[PDB]
Design a binder for this molecule. Structure first.
Ligand SMILES: *[C@H]1OC[C@@H](O[C@@H]2OC[C@@H](O)[C@H](O)[C@H]2O)[C@H](O)[C@H]1F
Length: 185
């Protein structure tokens, strides 16, 4: 599919060289950053969407995530489907597991306090996570059947908002350095 959304947010720390490439391709070079999120996807997320991607390059030197990323409103929720990471595997309150697209993911919930959000300024919101138990190999055509995660979260009381915001396959970093090149469709 054709992506129609370009996500490029940084809290201003360090260097984040984000390149909006052709089609669903994008690349990122970062060094000594604060927090940032870059990726391509869709302006309006969907619980039935099937995301395809190929990370030709995944080279984080520290804390970085290769993950499906999106938001909903009513209520405000930041969700993730982490396929790979750097030196830190994200975790939180364990809720259970879900098998999808050849891998097993742990389900977690966390909370952010006085943090930036899509609504601007700062607020408190919940984060839904699906983290692969082991890093997914990159360089191949990978698929994320989001509906599998959405349904698994629901069975654990993890309901998303009724107002869908953007949905992208992104690269998130935190006080680290690295490189990535991803193609989304
Ligand atoms: C999850 O990821 C980073 C951050 O979200 C950003 O908030 C500001 C908004 O304009 C950007 O589009 C978002 O990516 C959030 O604090 C964190 F919990």
């Amino acid at each position: 599919a054709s992506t129609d959304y370009w996500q490029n947010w940084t809290d201003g720390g360090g260097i984040v060289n984000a390149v909006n490439g052709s089609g669903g391709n994008y690349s990122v070079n970062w060094s000594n950053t604060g927090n940032f999120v870059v990726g391509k996807g869709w302006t309006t997320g969907s619980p039935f969407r099937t995301i395809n991607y190929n990370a030709g390059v995944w080279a984080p030197n520290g804390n970085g995530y290769l993950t499906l990323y999106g938001w909903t409103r009513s209520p405000l929720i930041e969700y993730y489907v982490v396929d790979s990471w750097g030196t830190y595997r994200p975790t939180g309150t364990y809720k259970g597991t879900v098998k999808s697209d050849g891998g097993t993911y742990d389900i977690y919930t966390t909370t952010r306090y006085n943090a930036p959000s899509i609504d601007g300024d700062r607020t408190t919101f919940t984060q839904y996570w699906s983290v692969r138990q082991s890093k997914r190999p990159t360089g191949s055509n990978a698929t994320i059947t989001f509906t599998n995660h959405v349904n698994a979260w629901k069975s654990h009381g993890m309901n998303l908002g009724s107002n869908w915001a953007y949905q992208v396959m992104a690269t998130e970093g935190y006080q680290s350095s690295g490189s990535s090149n991803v193609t989304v469709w």
